């Protein structure tokens, strides 16, 4: 089926957009010290899966990465624990700087796939 | 939910007492660790300073 390409590439576009938004949010919150209720910011990631044989890619869910918080010592802070160690986001920088580029490249590649498929479908529309 | 916007905030000042000059002027005072001189603001209400 050549119609399924549209909702395969749309799924790919949506998944890559979600991944790029997650990476941008992590980069923005790379240094945020607290949330709305004292909960430290946690790096988040998306889960990709196949639609199903094989099909498009769907984002199953968004999960906070389970890594120890890079806690720092600020005793004169209300959020400090009993030992004065406040918790900071466990977000690197190279990871997101590469995730953005990879997501953009995949997005552009799927755009090219959709363009080619649409062109050949329109060409087939005038058989004979 | 994926977007988490960022805003800046200032959780008040810091009360660490800075160092002090010895100007020898007879009417120059310095407070203790948690002292405050009480003055009268422009609107009549009181305020605390160092």
């Amino acid at each position: 089926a050549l119609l399924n390409i549209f909702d395969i590439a749309g799924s790919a576009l949506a998944a890559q957009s979600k991944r790029l938004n997650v990476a941008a949010s992590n980069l923005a919150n790379a240094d945020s010290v607290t949330g709305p209720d004292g909960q430290p910011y946690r790096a988040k990631q998306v889960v990709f899966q196949v639609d199903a044989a094989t099909g498009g890619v769907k984002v199953a869910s968004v999960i906070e990465s389970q890594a120890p918080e890079k806690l720092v010592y600020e005793p004169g802070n209300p959020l400090a624990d009993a030992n004065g160690y406040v918790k900071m986001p466990n977000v690197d920088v190279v990871g997101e700087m590469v995730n953005t580029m990879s997501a953009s490249r995949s997005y552009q590649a799927n755009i090219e796939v959709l363009n080619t498929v649409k062109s050949m479908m329109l060409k087939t529309l005038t058989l004979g | 939910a994926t977007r988490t916007l960022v805003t800046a905030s200032t959780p008040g000042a810091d009360m660490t007492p800075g160092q002090l000059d010895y100007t020898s002027r007879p009417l120059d005072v310095a407070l203790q660790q948690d002292g405050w001189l009480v003055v009268q603001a422009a609107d009549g209400a009181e305020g605390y300073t160092r």
Binding site: G10, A14, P36, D37 | L5, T7
Partner: peptide, 21 residues
Amino acid sequence: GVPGALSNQPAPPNEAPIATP
């Protein structure tokens, strides 16, 4: 329910409070 599908119920408004009251 699944994102991208069609549902006759409009989504509730999105809000981002700075601090929980």
